[PDB]
C-alpha cells in the first residue's frame, strides 16, 4: 500500500563544494608512477553540488532528479536511512526500471517493469525485523535482470559514481571517515569499481530510497536525511598513479590556464 | 519558490535581431535542460529550441534553423535566445521552459515563464 | 519530423459533460505525449504526461490513454474552470512538436 509522505511543498536547493572530489578509476588498467591522460566523464572539480535535505528537522520532500550523463552521488549518515536507489525514464509499469536495494546482509538488484509509488520508500517494521518493498512498488513484472550479492552501504562518508554506457551500468564507490559537517572534505581520493551490470536499459531519471519506520502516511518516521548530488561531464583529465597503482593526485584541464598548462606538458 | 523571468523583448525592424534572456531561480538550473516556445497572438504552441544540462547539444526547428542560437550560462541561471534576421511571421510570446521530458531532459517537473512579447515590423 | 494534429479543432460543452479531444501523430511516438491546459494570458499548464500519467495537483475528473498514433484526452465532468485550449505535445523525438490546439468553449 502506497501512502502520500510528500504533503508539503518543494524547498529550495542549497549548494556546496566539490572541491577535487569524484575522480573514478576510468579503467580495469594497472598503472604506476606514471602520469595518465584520460578522457572520460568526471566530475569537474570546484563545481557547485547540490545538498539535498530529503528529510528536514518531519518535512518529507525527496524528489526525482534527472540522470543525465552519469550521477555523482554522496551522504553522511549513521542512522542508515538511505537504502538505495531506483533508476529508469517513465518509473512506470511501461518500461524497464533498475531497483537497487540494500539491506543488512545483502543487496538486491533487479530490473523488471514496476509500479512504483508516488514517493516510494523502504518499509521497516519492529515486531525481530520486518522489511517489505511493497511501499517501494505495488507491483512487478516482465523481470529481464538479477543480482544479488553483499551490501554497498566521527561519521562515514559514501561516495558513489553512476553511468549507463552501452548497455552497461557502471558503480564506483568508495567508503571514508569525516569529521566535519554540512559540507564535503578537501583532499583527493579515488573511487574504486564497485560492479558492471549488463543490464540493457535507458536512464534519464533517478530517485532515492529511504528507510523509513512505522511508529497512514502520518504512521511512517525517520531521522533526518541528507545527500548531495553532482553531474558528470565529458572532461579531460591528467592523473597522477603512485607506485602501487593508486591515484593519489589528479588535474582537471579545463579548469584553469595553469592546469591546461599542466595537462599539456603532463607534470604536477 | 521556482522562477523563470523572460526580458529582453520589444520592437524591432525586419532583417534585424534581437538577443533575449530568462533569468532562472528556485531549483539547480544548471542539472536541466531548457526550451524556448514561442506563441503568435492567435496562434497555438510552437517549440523553438532546446539546449542540453552541459550547454552542449544544441537542437532547434526547422523554421529558425540556422537563424536562432540557443545558449546557457550556469554561473549566473541564464538561457540564452539570439536571434539574427528576424521576419515579421516571427511576431510572437517567447517563453522558457523546463518541459516534463522522459526521454531527453529527464525532467519529472514542468515550469514555465511569464513570457516576453517580440515584435518585428 | 513528426506531425501532431488534434480534432475537434473547437468543441462546445456544459458543466457536467464529457468530453473528449482527439489527438493524433503522423508517427508512431509510443507513450510520449503531453496534454496542457493554456488559459488566455497565462502559460500552458501540464495536465498529463506519458499519456497517461496524472501531474500532482490534477483533478481526478481529467484522464486520458491511448499508443502508437492515436491518443485520447478525457474529461469525465467538465466544470466551468475547464474552459481553456487543450494541446498535445510529442517528444518522442527532437523537434518537438505542439498539436493545432483544441479550444473547449461553454455551451
Known amino acids: 500500500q502506497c501512502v502520500n509522505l510528500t504533503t508539503r511543498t518543494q524547498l529550495p536547493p542549497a549548494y556546496t563544494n566539490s572541491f577535487t572530489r569524484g575522480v573514478y578509476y576510468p579503467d580495469k588498467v594497472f598503472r604506476s608512477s606514471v602520469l595518465h591522460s584520460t578522457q572520460d566523464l568526471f566530475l569537474p572539480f570546484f563545481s557547485n553540488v547540490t545538498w539535498f535535505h530529503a528529510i528536514h528537522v518531519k518535512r518529507f520532500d525527496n524528489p526525482v532528479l534527472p540522470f543525465n550523463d552519469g550521477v555523482y552521488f554522496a551522504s553522511t549518515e549513521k542512522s542508515n536511512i538511505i537504502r538505495g536507489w531506483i533508476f529508469g525514464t517513465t518509473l512506470d509499469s511501461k518500461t524497464q526500471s533498475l531497483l537497487i536495494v540494500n539491506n543488512a546482509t545483502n543487496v538486491v538488484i533487479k530490473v523488471c517493469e514496476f509500479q512504483f509509488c508516488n514517493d516510494p520508500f523502504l518499509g521497516v517494521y519492529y515486531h525481530s525485523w520486518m522489511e517489505s518493498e511493497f511501499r517501494v512498488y505495488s507491483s512487478a513484472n516482465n523481470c529481464t535482470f538479477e543480482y544479488v550479492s553483499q551490501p554497498f552501504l566521527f561519521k562515514n562518508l559514501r561516495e558513489f559514481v553512476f553511468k549507463n554506457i552501452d548497455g552497461y551500468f557502471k558503480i564506483y564507490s568508495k567508503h571514508t571517515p569525516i569529521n566535519l559537517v554540512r559540507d564535503l572534505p578537501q583532499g583527493f581520493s579515488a573511487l574504486e569499481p564497485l560492479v558492471d551490470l549488463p543490464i540493457g536499459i535507458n536512464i534519464t531519471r533517478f530517485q532515492t530510497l529511504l528507510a523509513l519506520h512505522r511508529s497512514s502516511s502520518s504512521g511512517w518516521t525517520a531521522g533526518a536525511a541528507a545527500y548531495y548530488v553532482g553531474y558528470l561531464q565529458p572532461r579531460t583529465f591528467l592523473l597522477k598513479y603512485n607506485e602501487n597503482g593508486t591515484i593519489t593526485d589528479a588535474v582537471d584541464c579545463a579548469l584553469d590556464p595553469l592546469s591546461e598548462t599542466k595537462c599539456t606538458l603532463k607534470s604536477f | 519558490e521556482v522562477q523563470l523571468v523572460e526580458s529582453g523583448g520589444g520592437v524591432v525592424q525586419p532583417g534585424g535581431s534581437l538577443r533575449l534572456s530568462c533569468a532562472a531561480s528556485?531549483?539547480?538550473?544548471?542539472?536541466?535542460?531548457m526550451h524556448w516556445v514561442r506563441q503568435a497572438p492567435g496562434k497555438g504552441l510552437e517549440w523553438v529550441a532546446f539546449?542540453?544540462?552541459?550547454?552542449?547539444?544544441?537542437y532547434y526547428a526547422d523554421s529558425v534553423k540556422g537563424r536562432f542560437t540557443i545558449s546557457r550560462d550556469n554561473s549566473k541561471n541564464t538561457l540564452y535566445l539570439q536571434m539574427k534576421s528576424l521576419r515579421a511571421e516571427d511576431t510572437a510570446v517567447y517563453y522558457c521552459?523546463?518541459?516534463?521530458?522522459?526521454?531527453?531532459?529527464?525532467?519529472?517537473?514542468?515550469?514555465w515563464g511569464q513570457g516576453t512579447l517580440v515584435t518585428v515590423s | 519530423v513528426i506531425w501532431m494534429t488534434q480534432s475537434p479543432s473547437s468543441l462546445s460543452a456544459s458543466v457536467g459533460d464529457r468530453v473528449t479531444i482527439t489527438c493524433q501523430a503522423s508517427?508512431?511516438?509510443?507513450?510520449?505525449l503531453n496534454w496542457y491546459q493554456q488559459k488566455p494570458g497565462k502559460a500552458p499548464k501540464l495536465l498529463i504526461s506519458?499519456?497517461?500519467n496524472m501531474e500532482t495537483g490534477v483533478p481526478s475528473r481529467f484522464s486520458g490513454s491511448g499508443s502508437g498514433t492515436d491518443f485520447t484526452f478525457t474529461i469525465s465532468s467538465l466544470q466551468p474552470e475547464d474552459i481553456a485550449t487543450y494541446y498535445c505535445?510529442?517528444?518522442?523525438?527532437?523537434?518537438?512538436?505542439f498539436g493545432p490546439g483544441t479550444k473547449v468553449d461553454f455551451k
Open positions: 528556485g531549483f539547480t538550473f544548471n542539472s536541466y535542460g
Open positions: 539546449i542540453r544540462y552541459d550547454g552542449g547539444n544544441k
Open positions: 521552459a523546463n518541459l516534463k521530458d522522459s526521454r531527453y531532459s529527464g525532467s519529472y517537473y514542468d515550469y
Open positions: 505535445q510529442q517528444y518522442d523525438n527532437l523537434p518537438f512538436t
Open positions: 506519458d499519456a497517461s
Open positions: 508517427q508512431d511516438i509510443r507513450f510520449y
